[PDB]
Structure 1
Amino acid sequence: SFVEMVDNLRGKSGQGYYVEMTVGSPPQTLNILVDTGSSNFAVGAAPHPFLHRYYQRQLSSTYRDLRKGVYVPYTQGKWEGELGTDLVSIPHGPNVTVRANIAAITESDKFFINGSNWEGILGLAYAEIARPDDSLEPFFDSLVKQTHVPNLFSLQLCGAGGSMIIGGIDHSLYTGSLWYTPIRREWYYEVIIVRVEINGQDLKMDCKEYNYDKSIVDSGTTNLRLPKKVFEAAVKSIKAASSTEKFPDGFWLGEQLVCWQAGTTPWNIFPVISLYLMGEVTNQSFRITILPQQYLRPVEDVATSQDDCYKFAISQSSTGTVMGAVIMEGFYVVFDRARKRIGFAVSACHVHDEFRTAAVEGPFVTLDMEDCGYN
C-alpha cells in the first residue's frame, strides 16, 4: 500500500525535506522537516517572521499539557518550548492516528529558515538523544507502539521532492541490491566507516579517524560533514584532482560559490568519493560511491547570469562524520530499526554523469572492522 506514500516529501537539499502532518482536533495541517539526526517532534506554536502558520494548542480539543519545558540545540539552530501531547496523523502516510509528544516551540534562534515552507521538525532517531531525557517517547516509537506499522521506514531524497515510506520498503524506488550496515548503537543512526577512497585511492588513515567521534546518517543535515583530519585530507585530494581550474579558498569553506557558463560545468575534474561501510557478515563491507554532482550543491546565481553556480557541500565537523542529505540523494536508504541495520541502494532518482555512476557495491573483504569504532 506504499504507492500512496511515494512523493510525499517536498523540498531541496539546502532547504530540508518536509512531510505534511496534522495535529490536534480539528486537524491542523503543518509541513514538518524530516530529521534522522534528532528525536524531538516540535512545531512552531507562536508567531514568527518566517512562519506562515503554526500550531494553536487552544483550538485543539485533544491537546494535553505536560507542564514541563524543553530545550533542544542542534549543530545549527536551537529552540525552546512547552511539552504536551496531541493526536497526530500523516495524510500521505499510513492510515492511522497516534497520540504523540509535541514540543510547542515558543522561542528559537537560527532554526526557522525564511521561505522554507516548513513549520516544525520530526526527529526520527531514538529516545536516548531525546530532550529533556530519554523518557520523552519519540514520535516513531509512539507510532510503532500504538498501531500495526512495522518498525522501519525508508527515505528516497531526490535532488534538483522525495518519498518517506513509513512501515516498509518500496522496491520500485531503487535498482540493484540493498546493502546493509549495522546500527552500532541506538541513539543517533550511528554506523561505522571502514575505508575511504577518492578516485580509487585509499586515504590511508587509521579508520578510527573516519568515525571520530561518531558517524551518523542524517537527513536533516545538508552537507557531508567530516572530522577535521579527514576533511583536510579529502579537500587536499579534491583540490589536486581539480587543480586544472582555480577556485577561491572561501569556496572550499562552503562560503563562496563557483560559477560556469550554462552547461559547461567540468564534472570530470572532480573525483568520486567511496565510503566503505561495515557489512552484515564477518570481515565484510560494501561501498557507496558519491559523484561530484552530489557534493557540489547547485545554488541560485548571485547575479543576472544564466550560469551554473554551486557551493561546496563538504564541510568540517567537530562532532564526527555526518552523512547528510547530499549523500542520501541518489540512494534509497532503509532505516531498518527492527533488525538494527541501515540499508543502501542506488535510487531510481539518481543524477546522471556521462561516464560515471553512483553505486552501491559489494561484497568487499575488510579485516578488523571492529577497530574502526571510536570509544
Structure 2
Amino acid sequence: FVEMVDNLRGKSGQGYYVEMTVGSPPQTLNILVDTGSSNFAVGAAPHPFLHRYYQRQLSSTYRDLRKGVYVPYTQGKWEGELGTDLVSIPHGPNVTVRANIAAITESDKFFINGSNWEGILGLAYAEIARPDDSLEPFFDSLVKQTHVPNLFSLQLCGVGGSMIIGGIDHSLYTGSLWYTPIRREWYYEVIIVRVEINGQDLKMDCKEYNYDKSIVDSGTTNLRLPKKVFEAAVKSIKAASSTEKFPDGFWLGEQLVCNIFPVISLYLMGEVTNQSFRITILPQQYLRPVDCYKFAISQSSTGTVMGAVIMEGFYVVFDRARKRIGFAVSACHVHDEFRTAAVEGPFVTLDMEDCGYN
C-alpha cells in the first residue's frame, strides 16, 4: 500500500481527486473521489473548464451501452451516454477492470472553473446509481473482476491525502479503529446517537440527528446537519464562543469572518448492543480558510452529511465486506498544542436503534 500513500490531490473546497486511466491505449484523467454517489462519470467533450476529457473514438476497448442518463442535482446537472471500457488506477492496485462509464456530454454547475479534475468516482452502492441499480458501480466491478479485497480507506488531509484500495495502512492513523455499522447499503448510511458541544449534550431526541439519514460523504465539504439539529448546535456554539461576538450571517454562512471555539462530538452506534463510541473535531476542521474563514457547518433537508469537515480529522475505513465504517485519529489532521481530534470508546448508550429514521 506504500504505492497508494499520497495518491490524492486537490484544492481547498474543490474536492479530492485520484489519477485514473480509461480506454486502450490508456487515457489519463483526474477523478473526484466521492463516497456520496455511485456513478463513474467523466467529461467526454471539450467543456472550456476541463484540462482533459475522455475521447471514446481513441479507445479500441470502448463498448456502447446505447442508453443515456440525465442526472439533476439541487443546483446543476450532468447528462451522459453510457458505455463500458477498461479502467486502471496508476497509484492503486496493479489491475485493470471493465467498468461502466458515463460519458458526460452536457452539464451545468457540475465542473468547477479552475479545478484540476474532469470526472467523478462514485464509491457508494448500486441502489443510488443513475439511471437505476442495474448499473454496477465501479468498486463493485473492481471486487467482482479481481482479488482486491472489498474495502477501501480514506485519509483526507487539510490539499492531499490517501485512498488505500483493498486495505488499511496503519501508518495513516494513531490509536485504534472504532467501527459503526453501515445501516443500509445505498449511501454509506450511519447512525448518530448523541451530540456534544464541548462535552455538553444537545439533549435532543436522537432521531433528529438522523432525519432523514446520516451519511459519510467525501464529495461534500461541510458538516451538514438537519435544521432542527443545526439550530440547536449553533445556539450552543454561539454560547460557548461568546467571548467574541459575530454577525448572525456568519453562522448562516452568508458572510465570512476575519480556543474560543468548542469541540464537536458525535457519538456513533457501536458494533455491540448498547455500545457506542465518539469522534471529536476541532474548530480547525469546521472553520475553513477562504485570515478569512467560512463557518462550514450548515443546515440540511437531506439529513446529516459528514463531509470533509469530519473526514479531515480521521482515517476512515469503508469496510464493505463487513458492512461497517471505521474511524481512527488521522496522523495528518490539523490541530494545536491544546486540543486534538479524538476517537474514544466504549460508551454505554441505550435505545440506539430508536435513533434511525424509518
Distance in 2 between residues matched to 1:12 and 1:224, nearest whole Å: 18
Aligned in 2, Cα 1:101/1:132: closer, same or farther, shift over 3 Å? Answer: same
The 1:108–1:143 alpha-carbon spacing in structure 2 relative to 1, beyond 3 Å, is same
Q: 1:76 to 1:165 in 2, by over 3 A?
A: farther
Matched, 1:277 2:273: no
Give the direction of change, closer, same or farther, for the CA distance of 1:63–1:160 in structure 2 (3 Å limit).
Answer: closer
Q: Distance in 2 between matches of 1:100 and 1:353?
A: 43
- Once residues 313 and 197 of structure 2 are traced to their aligned partners in structure 1, the CA distance between those partners, rounded to angstroms, is 18
CA deviations on 1:82-126 (whole Å, 9 max, x unpaired) are 000000000000000000000001111111111110000000000
* Structure 2: gaps spanning 5 or more residues: none
Match of 1:321 in 2: 304
Contact map agreement 1:13 1:325 (CA 8 A) in 2:
no
In the TM superposition, what whole-angstrom CA distance separates every residue of 1:2-29 from its partner, at most 9, and x where no partner exists? 0000000001451100000000111110
Using the TM superposition, give the Cα deviation of residue 178 of structure 1 relative to its aligned residue in structure 2, in angstroms. 0.2
How far residue 317 of structure 1 moved from its aligned partner, in angstroms, is 0.3
| Secondary structure at 1:143 match in 2 | helix
Per-residue deviation at 1:346? 0.2
Are the structure 2 counterparts of residues 184 and 309 from structure 1 closer, same or farther at C-alpha, using a change threshold of 3 Å?
same
2: distance between equivalents of 1:283 and 1:138? 34
Could you say what secondary structure the match of 1:271 adopts?
A: coil
1:145-191 superposed Cα distances (whole Å, 9 cap, x missing partner): 00000000000000060000000000010010000000000000000
Contact 2:66 2:82 in 1 (8 A): yes
Q: State the match for 2:119 in structure 1.
A: 120
Conserved? CA contact 1:10–1:161, under 8 Å: yes
| SS at 1:316 equivalent | strand
The answer for the alignment partner of 1:263 in structure 2 is none
In 1, Cα distance between equivalents of 2:159 and 2:143: 33
Partner of 2:327: 344
Is this contact kept in 2: 1:13–1:326, CA < 8 A?
A: no
Q: Residues 242-279 of structure 1, C-alpha deviation per residue, up to 9 Å, x if partnerless? A: 222232222112231111xxxxxxxx111100000000
Which range moves more in the overlay, 193-202 or 75-84?
Answer: 75-84
TM-score by length of 1: 0.94
Q: Separation in 1 of the partners of 2:242 and 2:105? A: 49
Secondary structure at 2:346 match in 1: strand
The equivalent residue for 1:55 is: 54
Q: 1:320-354 CA distances to partner (integer Å, 9 max, x unpaired)?
A: 10000111002000000000000000010021222
Q: Secondary structure at the match of 2:292?
A: strand
Asked if 2 retains the 8 angstrom alpha-carbon contact of 1:13 and 1:222, the reply is no
2:11/2:115 contact within 8 Å kept: no
Comparing 229-238 with 348-357, greater Cα deviation is found at 348-357
RMSD: 1.0
Between stretches 66-75 and 190-199, larger displacement belongs to 66-75
Structure 1 pair 92–160 and aligned structure 2 pair: CA distance change class (3 A): closer
Q: In the alignment, is the contact (CA less than 8 A) between 2:17 and 2:117 conserved in 1?
A: yes
Paired residue secondary structure (1:344): strand
The answer to whether structure 1 residue 367 and structure 2 residue 358 are counterparts is no
> What SS does structure 2 have at the residue aligned with 1:86?
strand
Quickly say closer, same or farther: Cα 1:75–1:5, change in 2 above 3 A. farther
Distance in 1 between residues matched to 2:281 and 2:313, nearest whole Å: 9
| 1:331 paired to 2:322 | no
Seq. identity, % = 100
Q: Is the 1:183–1:340 Cα contact (8 Å) retained in structure 2? A: yes
Query: Does structure 1 conserve the Cα–Cα contact (< 8 Å) formed by 2:9 and 2:159?
Result: no
- How many residue pairs match? The answer is 357
* Distance in 1 (alpha carbons) for counterparts of 2:324 and 2:228: 27
Q: Which residue of 2 aligns with 1:39?
A: 38
Shift of the alpha carbon at 1:74?
A: 3.6
Aligned counterparts of 2:357 and 2:12: Cα–Cα separation in 1: 29
Contact 2:282–2:335 at 8 Å: present in 1 too? no
What SS class does the counterpart of residue 250 from structure 1 fall into?
helix
**When the two structures are superposed, what TM-score results if normalisation uses the length of structure 2?**
0.98
- Between 1:242-251 and 1:12-21, the stretch displaced more is 242-251
- Give the superposition deviation at 1:142: 0.2
Please give the per-residue CA displacement for 1:214-238, whole angstroms capped at 9, x wherever unaligned. 0000000000000010010111111
- 1:290 paired to 2:281: yes
Deviation at 1:76, TM superposition (A): 4.4
Alpha-carbon distance, 1:71 to partner: 1.7
Contact map agreement 1:12 1:159 (CA 8 A) in 2? no
CA distance in structure 2 between the aligned counterparts of 1:258 and 1:214, rounded to whole angstroms: 31
| 1:173/1:134 CA distance change after superposition, 3 Å | same
What residue number does 1:168 align with?
A: 167
Q: Deviations over 1:304-329 (max 9, x none)?
A: xxxx1111100110011000011100
3-state DSSP of counterpart to 2:82? strand
Question: Secondary structure, in 3 states, of the residue corresponding to 1:87?
Answer: strand
**Alpha-carbon separation, structure 2, partners of 1:75 and 1:219:** 18
Secondary structure at the counterpart of residue 140 of structure 1: helix
Is residue 10–residue 159 contact of structure 2 (8 Å, CA) maintained in 1? Answer: no
The 1-side partners of 2:17 and 2:247 are apart by 33
Structure 1 residue 205, shift from structure 2 partner? 0.3
Alpha-carbon distance in 2 for matches of 1:98, 1:173 = 27
How far apart are residue 77 of structure 1 and its match? 3.3
